[PDB]
Amino acid sequence: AMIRKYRYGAPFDTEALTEKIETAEEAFPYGEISQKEGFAFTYIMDEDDIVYGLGESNRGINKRGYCYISNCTDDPIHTEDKRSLYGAHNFIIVSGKTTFGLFFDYPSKLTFDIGYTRMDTLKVSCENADLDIYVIEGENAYDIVKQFRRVIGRSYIPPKFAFGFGQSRYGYTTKEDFRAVAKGYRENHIPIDMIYMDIDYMQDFKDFTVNEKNFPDFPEFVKEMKDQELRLIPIIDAGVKVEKGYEVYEEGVKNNYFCKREDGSDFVAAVWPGDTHFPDMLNPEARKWFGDKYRFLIDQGIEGFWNDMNEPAIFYSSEGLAEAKEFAGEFAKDTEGKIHPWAMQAKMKDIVNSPEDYKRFYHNVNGKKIRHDKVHNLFGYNMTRAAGEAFERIDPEKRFLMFSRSSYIGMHRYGGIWMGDNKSWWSHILLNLKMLPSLNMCGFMYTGADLGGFGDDTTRDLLLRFLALGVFTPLMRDHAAEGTREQECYQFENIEDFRSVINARYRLVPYLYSEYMKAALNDDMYFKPLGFVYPDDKMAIRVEDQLMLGNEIMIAPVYEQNARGRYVYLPEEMKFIKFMPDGSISEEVLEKGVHYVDVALNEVPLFIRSGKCIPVAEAAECVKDIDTENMQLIGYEGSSYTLYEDDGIHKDYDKKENYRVLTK
Amino acid sequence: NAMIRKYRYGAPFDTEALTEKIETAEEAFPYGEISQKEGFAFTYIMDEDDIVYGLGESNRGINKRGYCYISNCTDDPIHTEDKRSLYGAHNFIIVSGKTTFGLFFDYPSKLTFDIGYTRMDTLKVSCENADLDIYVIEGENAYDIVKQFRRVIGRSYIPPKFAFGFGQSRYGYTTKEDFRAVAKGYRENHIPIDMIYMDIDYMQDFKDFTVNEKNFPDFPEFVKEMKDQELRLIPIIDAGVKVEKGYEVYEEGVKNNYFCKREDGSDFVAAVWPGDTHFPDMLNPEARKWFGDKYRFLIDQGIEGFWNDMNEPAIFYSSEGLAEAKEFAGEFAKDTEGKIHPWAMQAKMKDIVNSPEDYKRFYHNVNGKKIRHDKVHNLFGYNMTRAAGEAFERIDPEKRFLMFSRSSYIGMHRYGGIWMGDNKSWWSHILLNLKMLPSLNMCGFMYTGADLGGFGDDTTRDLLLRFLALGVFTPLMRDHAAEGTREQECYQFENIEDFRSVINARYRLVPYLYSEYMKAALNDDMYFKPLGFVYPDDKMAIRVEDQLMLGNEIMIAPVYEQNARGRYVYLPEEMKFIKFMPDGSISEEVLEKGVHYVDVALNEVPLFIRSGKCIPVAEAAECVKDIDTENMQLIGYEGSSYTLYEDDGIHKDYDKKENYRVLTK
Numbered sequence A: 001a002m003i004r005k006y007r008y009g010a011p012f013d014t015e016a017l018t019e020k021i022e023t024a025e026e027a028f029p030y031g032e033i034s035q036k037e038g039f040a041f042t043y044i045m046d047e048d049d050i051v052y053g054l055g056e057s058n059r060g061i062n063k064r065g066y067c068y069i070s071n072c073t074d075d076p077i078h079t080e081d082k083r084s085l086y087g088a089h090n091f092i093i094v095s096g097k098t099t100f101g102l103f104f105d106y107p108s109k110l111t112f113d114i115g116y117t118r119m120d121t122l123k124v125s126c127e128n129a130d131l132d133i134y135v136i137e138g139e140n141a142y143d144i145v146k147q148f149r150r151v152i153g154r155s156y157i158p159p160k161f162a163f164g165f166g167q168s169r170y171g172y173t174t175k176e177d178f179r180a181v182a183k184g185y186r187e188n189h190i191p192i193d194m195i196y197m198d199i200d201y202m203q204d205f206k207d208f209t210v211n212e213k214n215f216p217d218f219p220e221f222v223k224e225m226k227d228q229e230l231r232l233i234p235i236i237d238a239g240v241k242v243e244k245g246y247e248v249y250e251e252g253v254k255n256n257y258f259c260k261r262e263d264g265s266d267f268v269a270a271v272w273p274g275d276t277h278f279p280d281m282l283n284p285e286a287r288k289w290f291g292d293k294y295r296f297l298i299d300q301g302i303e304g305f306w307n308d309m310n311e312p313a314i315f316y317s318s319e320g321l322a323e324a325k326e327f328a329g330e331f332a333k334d335t336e337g338k339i340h341p342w343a344m345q346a347k348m349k350d351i352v353n354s355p356e357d358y359k360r361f362y363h364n365v366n367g368k369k370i371r372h373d374k375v376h377n378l379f380g381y382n383m384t385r386a387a388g389e390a391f392e393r394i395d396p397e398k399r400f401l402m403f404s405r406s407s408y409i410g411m412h413r414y415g416g417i418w419m420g421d422n423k424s425w426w427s428h429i430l431l432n433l434k435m436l437p438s439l440n441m442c443g444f445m446y447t448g449a450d451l452g453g454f455g456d457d458t459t460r461d462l463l464l465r466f467l468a469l470g471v472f473t474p475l476m477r478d479h480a481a482e483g484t485r486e487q488e489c490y491q492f493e494n495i496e497d498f499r500s501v502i503n504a505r506y507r508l509v510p511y512l513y514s515e516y517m518k519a520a521l522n523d524d525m526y527f528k529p530l531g532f533v534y535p536d537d538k539m540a541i542r543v544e545d546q547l548m549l550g551n552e553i554m555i556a557p558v559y560e561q562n563a564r565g566r567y568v569y570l571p572e573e574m575k576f577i578k579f580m581p582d583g584s585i586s587e588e589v590l591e592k593g594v595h596y597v598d599v600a601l602n603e604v605p606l607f608i609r610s611g612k613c614i615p616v617a618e619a620a621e622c623v624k625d626i627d628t629e630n631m632q633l634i635g636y637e638g639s640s641y642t643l644y645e646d647d648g649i650h651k652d653y654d655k656k657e658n659y660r661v662l663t664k
Numbered sequence B: 001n002a003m004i005r006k007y008r009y010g011a012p013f014d015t016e017a018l019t020e021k022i023e024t025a026e027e028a029f030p031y032g033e034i035s036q037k038e039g040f041a042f043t044y045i046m047d048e049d050d051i052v053y054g055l056g057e058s059n060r061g062i063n064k065r066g067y068c069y070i071s072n073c074t075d076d077p078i079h080t081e082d083k084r085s086l087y088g089a090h091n092f093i094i095v096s097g098k099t100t101f102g103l104f105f106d107y108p109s110k111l112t113f114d115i116g117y118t119r120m121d122t123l124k125v126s127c128e129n130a131d132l133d134i135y136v137i138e139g140e141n142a143y144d145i146v147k148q149f150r151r152v153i154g155r156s157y158i159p160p161k162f163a164f165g166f167g168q169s170r171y172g173y174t175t176k177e178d179f180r181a182v183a184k185g186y187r188e189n190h191i192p193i194d195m196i197y198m199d200i201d202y203m204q205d206f207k208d209f210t211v212n213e214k215n216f217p218d219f220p221e222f223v224k225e226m227k228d229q230e231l232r233l234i235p236i237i238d239a240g241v242k243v244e245k246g247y248e249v250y251e252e253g254v255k256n257n258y259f260c261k262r263e264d265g266s267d268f269v270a271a272v273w274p275g276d277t278h279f280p281d282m283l284n285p286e287a288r289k290w291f292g293d294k295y296r297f298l299i300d301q302g303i304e305g306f307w308n309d310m311n312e313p314a315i316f317y318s319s320e321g322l323a324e325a326k327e328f329a330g331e332f333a334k335d336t337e338g339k340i341h342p343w344a345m346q347a348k349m350k351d352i353v354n355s356p357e358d359y360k361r362f363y364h365n366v367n368g369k370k371i372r373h374d375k376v377h378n379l380f381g382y383n384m385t386r387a388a389g390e391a392f393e394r395i396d397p398e399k400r401f402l403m404f405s406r407s408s409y410i411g412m413h414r415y416g417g418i419w420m421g422d423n424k425s426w427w428s429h430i431l432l433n434l435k436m437l438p439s440l441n442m443c444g445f446m447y448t449g450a451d452l453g454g455f456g457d458d459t460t461r462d463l464l465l466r467f468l469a470l471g472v473f474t475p476l477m478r479d480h481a482a483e484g485t486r487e488q489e490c491y492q493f494e495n496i497e498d499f500r501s502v503i504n505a506r507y508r509l510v511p512y513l514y515s516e517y518m519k520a521a522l523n524d525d526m527y528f529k530p531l532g533f534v535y536p537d538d539k540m541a542i543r544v545e546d547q548l549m550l551g552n553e554i555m556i557a558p559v560y561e562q563n564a565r566g567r568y569v570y571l572p573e574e575m576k577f578i579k580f581m582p583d584g585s586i587s588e589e590v591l592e593k594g595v596h597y598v599d600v601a602l603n604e605v606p607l608f609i610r611s612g613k614c615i616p617v618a619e620a621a622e623c624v625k626d627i628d629t630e631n632m633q634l635i636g637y638e639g640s641s642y643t644l645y646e647d648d649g650i651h652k653d654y655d656k657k658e659n660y661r662v663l664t665k
């Protein structure tokens, strides 16, 4: 009713939406649509108009003033200029005097020119007038989003343990590597529930093996780790290594489960294991075959997975590789200097994630051959769907921890997202923050960034400020790239400081989980821009470095080096809370308005809204040990918090026992 | 100045950074601990509250704690927070806390500042060779310590007045049409401007000290076509002298042994824009004078300023590097077994650029003894600008020339300014350009700016405007853009009157800004100051990093977040919030000491006036020579006094009672 679906050409069915919406028949309600060059929507914006959405895209909460292209790209350098990151989330809302939401249900490259060309002009275009546009209406932007959240289906719900802290590093390889990490944390009493395993745990980077030489009995090691409440979260890449004898490879080939070239042969793309093949994620059968392979690890005790390189990322195809070796040929023999080293360098770079490669292989969809570039942004989506759907067969009642890098809307039902290869820059603390709400609008609630920065060298302080933001993000893990400064918490001085920050995560767990469960089950938001909560405050709607969490709190982390505080705007009176390093909790009332607050490196800050309160537990070293019984209530006297909780393992969501009102 | 003990280690190369002879102190080192096991290392444990200023043009913020900085002039077009080395080497730092003192490491080689990077409480300055002078500057506070240092390094370079105008630039402008188009585009729209820069294209095949003969049949006249319009062309000069027979500059450098040379006596070859080039031996006096004198060519044609580029010096690849690369390309090409990953190929291409190894392959002839370049690496750009400067004074001693350089070392500030190089059209770079200001001032470099709009990548309308609004206050205010970037000339955007509004604020402030720069340079004082220097005992002010004091009257606080309509500020004393309005009016508002949010729209230029002060504001003019300083509105507080310095802005006659006049509100 307050949602209509306008249809152009013959759209590919993305299965993005779970709710049926009939094809409206009147005139498109806003702006203009054109077909002189492919397809274009053009809209003129009110000078005060704010644009939200685009989920995991570059820049800030208000998208006005730059260009975003949905075109899932493996790009390790997230600088302000980049137009396409990992995600393809074609949902925007124009909010102002004239407010409306738009979802562009489209598989391929979609360019959102949001004021970049002309300031007052919003122009969303793509090569093909074959798509569905969904127009949503409501009073405010929050209401437009909650409607969207309805029609795309309930977001993924992770197991309770995933609301713990997780340690990860590209490099962990042996039982020793892993033990010294468990050692490092448990011996210094720093809580943690997860350690991630990156590609070095496989045999020759073969999907669905383990290095038999390093884990002669992987299952027992898993049980040894799990005994200390450490759950090993293995990675899975998109490419299956080409290698005779390799079971997963032989099957893929024999049953035509792989993407093929225009000639029927299996397309080769090179990744970690060298030459690989990509499972045909768009083909229902291949998807059940791929998903089922997760049993290999589940049967061994594994309760979580992360999907990577699933744009899919291509270092080089056999086609590109020959072009390059060949060019290098003329370079090597160049006497006249007709071939500059810059160009040789340019070719090496162009064979990576080549657009030419993305038209070299095809998907087989219920018998229809479709070229990959045409459906490019669905690949990661469906790889994560394969896992999810396979999960539900293996054990319909159990929750598995699951996240992916690349995604498209609809994938939000089967798994969360991590924000990819960030760097150890202070600006990336803010980027982590700004992306949260957008992702929530698009259904992705279980998200977080690599704390302390994936790439490059971190410092003791960058890490602590990153963690302090992580405290509030459902996914909280410290991750680091190959050969960077070691950034485990125990790899610094005065380690107790890190204990302090993590401790705060582990006291806030029952609240954060609660607020998560309530949001997901209600097709609602976990993180909200201040604009959603105080739509009348023309000051609040412009704030981009503070977020509302649930209905009880606001967060505002420090993201500047050497700072000892930061400016905040409070659209209402709140109590200002800091989790102190001695184990106590500072509390101060602060009137609405502007304020500079003092927040030391080893203190964690949050605000509690007027007439509200939240439960806080004692610090425990793992999710299982948190005493949920006698929690302290912080906030406003006479207020009440409805606390959700369940076994945090199965999907028994609708019990009256799951709710329990607390009054301060 | 015997409040500046100097400590000697080894047999230091003389950088000529100081103009003041300081004797070699004789006691143990006044602070921390010195070690000499595997080179040289100063190690100091800092107090928790200590702040660290300095390092001029270096990465990150005002307070330098919490990272690692390396003096090693490097051509790096990507200015991300992780970078440890950019273009300049300004080895001056100051520890500001319970124990305040200042340090200058006079060392021309790779010098590492580990400022609380490894251990948070640990400052460690180390290098390979113990061949260095270390100046310890004692004093009451940081500001004072900086004033001392400014005096032993000598008066800062002083630009002609026309350089406080606005300038337009692009790695693209090639023909008369292009330049005329910039002319017409600005003039027709009554947008103030004084300079148009000429990038490497005006040359004859990138040959230094030539001009394109087909492009510019009669250059002196075209230069005149522009000058009559109050537009001054500022051509670039590159470090590399193109290798080519018949090319006079090359023939002479070779004939007279003026180029840097391989170990074996051969003229070292480095590839740059022109192709193979030689580098003029900037550490050789005869060479330095020969190169400097070459500027006459352009000066005798009516040119009144220059910029020196690529002078780290930047190297695309050496002859040795190309060969090594082509031979690797071969192995890769014929490799049938996948022995050679494409990543290794790609890594080799990257390796040949600015290859530390090349910097080991050429020497400087310093009156007799040959010195391997890497041993004096941070000096190259400094002595190239020194070549140009000394030349100017031989060529015409009365007249001031516009001069600035990319690479630099303390001491170069006497001969020219610098721009902050290849930044990017990122909002974060507006702040980066802000934060570098104070630091560069502490090291003598006052004439500085950044590429407004962002050099690299594509800018937007709002980004360019917020950049200009900072640029209003930086002595170098220049719009420059990379090859193939979106056009960022002010006339290439809708509602052009918002660019005329903003750049009006500049020309209206020019009388006062010029005044402060002149006063500051002649007094060995700073033009920009961190708030700590002015409000030493306000714990809140000593940590403000995104505001700056300018002279002794005003404070700046640029908007740097995209889509923001205001920003938070902290005021250490009562002040008049002022906005140059898009209508021409100047809004005024008193705000007390404390935190505030102030509305600054895109097309408004903000600034604050200190309690007890005021400033002159002229009416808008479209070029510097047309500005009317006779009757200027005074903006500020009642019964305050401003001393206006002014002169002909052309010659070098600075010490005269007639240059000053007291204005009273």
Ligand SMILES: C[C@H]1O[C@H](O[C@H]2[C@H](O)[C@@H](O)[C@@H](O[C@H]3[C@H](O)[C@@H](O)[C@@H](O)O[C@@H]3CO)O[C@@H]2CO)[C@H](O)[C@@H](O)[C@@H]1N[C@H]1C=C(CO)[C@@H](O)[C@H](O)[C@H]1O
Pocket: A074, A075, A076, A077, A169, A170, A198, A199, A235, A308, A309, A313, A405, A420, A421, A455, A480, A481, A482
């Ligand atoms: C691990 C990471 O590797 C791949 O990306 C890397 C590039 O291939 C490298 O060339 C290198 O690029 C840097 C260059 O040296 C230089 O141009 C500099 O300016 O910066 C560049 C980027 O920092 O570094 C890249 C990233 O470190 C691949 O594209 C990327 O997606 C990979 N990340 C995934 C893989 C692993 C291992 O399974 C996980 O640890 C990550 O979390 C994944 O997201």
Ligand SMILES: C[C@H]1O[C@H](O[C@H]2[C@H](O)[C@@H](O)[C@@H](O[C@H]3[C@H](O)[C@@H](O)[C@@H](O)O[C@@H]3CO)O[C@@H]2CO)[C@H](O)[C@@H](O)[C@@H]1N[C@H]1C=C(CO)[C@@H](O)[C@H](O)[C@H]1O
Pocket: B075, B076, B077, B078, B170, B171, B199, B200, B236, B309, B310, B314, B406, B421, B422, B456, B457, B480, B482, B483
């Ligand atoms: C003009 C500029 O060119 C040289 O640097 C360029 C590189 O050679 C290119 O490879 C390219 O780098 C980009 C990467 O491919 C990409 O990874 C992305 O991250 O951005 C990189 C840089 O934006 O672009 C570079 C910049 O164009 C040279 O080393 C550099 O120092 C040059 N700058 C000076 C030269 C000119 C022309 O005479 C002047 O206009 C400038 O103002 C100078 O500062």
